[PDB]
């Protein structure tokens, strides 16, 4: 009833920390994201993840980062984790140059596209807006 | 003997579809703050859904936005966990 965790490594953790953005996107600086990224790095490192932080990535870079990760050999890994910190809209996340679909980033790790993570958990943590609505709360 | 290609994914969104996500420039985003605090105390002993559920609670209760702009003043936030997992997940043993 539990995922098998008896592996040499817990797994790889990719942190994409997008703070500054190309003026053409019209998106401003994400102050505070550096403190997030460091805090996240220590946490997931403590869990046992092999964490690497990438900063101010383009859409092509983000795609390449995850594509390459899915092509690696995860035979000795229990799982995979990816953390996205950036601006966003519904179903999309911002690179420096603009937006890219979240579906495209994660599709690389599908069972038929990453056999060494088959039956293994693939985790995606996403700090980003998903629209413009706000929650006023109640009571 | 076969397994769905979309299985064994988990998405921990900072917020629900259609909504914004709050970030404090001095302290960091709400979701990450809560996630790290809970992971620091319970990352090894709690199941991932238990962890993220507590993160949900922490973000929903401990946080409320402050802003000079009234449009963004005293707003609230609830995160969003999407699970296609087939097993319970513990980060230990």
């Amino acid at each position: 009833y539990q995922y098998n965790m008896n592996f040499e490594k817990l797994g790889k953790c990719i942190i994409i920390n997008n703070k500054n953005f190309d003026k053409v996107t019209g998106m401003g600086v994400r102050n505070g994201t550096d403190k997030d990224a460091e805090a996240l790095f220590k946490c997931f490192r403590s869990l046992g993840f092999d964490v690497i932080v990438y900063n101010d990535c383009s859409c092509a870079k983000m795609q390449d980062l995850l594509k390459k990760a899915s092509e690696e050999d995860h035979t000795n890994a229990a799982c995979f984790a990816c953390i996205l910190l950036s601006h966003g809209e519904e179903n999309v996340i911002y690179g420096k140059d603009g937006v890219t679909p979240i579906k495209d980033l994660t599709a690389h790790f599908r069972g038929d596209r990453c056999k060494t993570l088959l039956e293994k958990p693939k985790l995606f943590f996403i700090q980003a807006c998903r629209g413009t609505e706000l929650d006023d709360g109640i009571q | 003997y076969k397994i769905p290609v979309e299985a064994d994914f988990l998405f921990a969104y900072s917020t629900v579809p259609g909504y914004a996500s709050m970030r404090n420039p001095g302290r960091g985003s709400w979701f990450v703050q809560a996630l790290c605090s809970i992971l620091e105390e319970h990352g090894k002993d709690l199941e991932i859904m238990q962890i993220l559920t507590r993160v949900n609670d922490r973000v929903a209760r401990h946080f409320e936005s402050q802003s000079d702009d009234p449009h963004f003043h005293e707003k609230k936030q609830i995160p969003c966990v999407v699970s296609m997992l087939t097993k319970e997940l513990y980060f230990s043993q």
């Binding site: - | 914004a20 709050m22 970030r23 404090n24």
Partner: peptide
């Protein structure tokens, strides 16, 4: 308090 900014938004993403």
């Amino acid at each position: 308090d900014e938004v993403x």
